[PDB]
Amino acid sequence: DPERRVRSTLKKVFGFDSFKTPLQESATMAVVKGNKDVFVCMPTGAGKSLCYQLPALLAKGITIVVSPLIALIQDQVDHLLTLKVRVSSLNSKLSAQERKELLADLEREKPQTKILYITPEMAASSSFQPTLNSLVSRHLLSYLVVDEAHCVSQWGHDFRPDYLRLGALRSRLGHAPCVALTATATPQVQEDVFAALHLKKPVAIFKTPCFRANLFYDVQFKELISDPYGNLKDFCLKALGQLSGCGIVYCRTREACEQLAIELSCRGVNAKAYHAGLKASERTLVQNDWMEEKVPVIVATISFGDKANVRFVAHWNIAKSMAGYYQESGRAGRDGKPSWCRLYYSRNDRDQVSFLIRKEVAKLQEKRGNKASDKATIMAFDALVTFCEELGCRHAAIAKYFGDALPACAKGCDHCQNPTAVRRRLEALERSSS
Ligand SMILES: Nc1ncnc2c1ncn2[C@@H]1O[C@H](COP(=O)(O)OP(=O)(O)O)[C@@H](O)[C@H]1O
Ligand SMILES: O=C(NC[C@H]1CCCO1)NC1CCCCC1
Ligand SMILES: [Mg+2]
Ligand SMILES: [Zn+2]
């Protein structure tokens, strides 16, 4: 029984009685089994770390774990040191004395080190190779783990050249299985991971689906609304009337944030602005006022840094990216009860956000020259423009983006609930500028 061994270690070392989801459990079992290569794609906070850290302890040899930054290695190392586990790290920030003590440990038979964190630069170093081949010689490597695996991809919004070295490394440790883990969930990033890391076919995939059936999506066009602030007012109120629950209004500028909270409060719905301009004392009062439910609606530019009963998330201005919008809106309806997600689109608004992105990309060019990755920035915005202008199910467009199959829309979107309503609105959009 592996399930005995897993259950024991989850308690005795990690101090958990259960797995956060069955998907975390399914992934973790496949890694223990050790026959296949594995891809774990779950949101940040889902406990991806556990899926390789636990199996490493049940194995005979050493697990090598590649993480992008010494700052994230250190947090991991300290976490595991407070749980009485034999874990070390190899990097520039170590002394030459400590570096000699660790390399000595690796050149014994049956070393004390059980998990070795290393950067991709250090894994691809000249100075590391004798040690690495010595571990290969003596069949002392149980696994190879590549955390933050999206770093291989130009489409993944954090490219790192050194991650492309990890492929050849992988085929040299062919005896041992490889686990690749990320929160970025686009199909192209997954294609890039599979080829860049020379993963072995059939890959066992553990992927959180991005369809939530309890969310209603719609997209209104501001060019067509006679009374914009009142349209929003009614929306907020309807979502709070079955008062009950809370809501979020997102927007881009400080000025619009303030005007929005004034216009909502003046027209029968209590609301307070929330942005980086105001003082940190006043920031935290608005935060606390929304959490304990004195004030039901918060109008914001930026996150706090959980909340179960958000009955609506409204976007006043189009977001910078599809991943952006999916994250932001998806703060709605965590309790499982019906919520509403609305996006107020306009073509002038689209142009403003479009201009800003490109001006930001020019700055990065001035600084470091042209990069293939800047097209990923543009495409990510464009996917959300298409979402706004196309006749189609809302949830499916989201699904298409993250490479999921056609989800069953329970009339859970404006398009599917009434295809012709939406068509009539898209015809009148085009008549506006006739
Ligand atoms: N089975 C579990 N039960 C409860 N909490 C867990 C479990 N597994 C992991 N966690 C916790 O969840 C948090 C997030 O985990 P982490 O591995 O950093 O997530 P990810 O890397 O996917 O973003 C950590 O504090 C971790 O201790
Ligand atoms: O699915 C999520 N989860 C959204 C979470 C992240 C923080 C708040 O919401 N994000 C991932 C990362 C971006 C592309 C693939 C999807
Ligand atoms: Mg992680
Ligand atoms: Zn639909």
From Swiss-Prot:
Residues 29-203 form the Helicase ATP-binding domain. Zn(2+) binds at residues 393, 409, 413, 416. A motif (DEAH box) lies at residues 147-150. Changing residue 334 to G: Loss of helicase activity (in a residue 11-526 fragment). Residues 231-385 form the Helicase C-terminal domain. ATP binds at residues 16, 18, 20, 24, 43, 45-49. It comes from the Eukaryota. Changing residue 155 to A: Loss of helicase activity, reduced DNA-binding (in a residue 11-526 fragment). The alpha-helix immediately C-terminal to the Zn(2+)-binding site (residues 438-453, characterized in C-terminally truncated contructs) is required for helicase activity, is positively charged, and may play a role in DNA-binding and choice of substrates. Belongs to the helicase family. RecQ subfamily. This is ATP-dependent DNA helicase Q5. It comes from Homo sapiens.
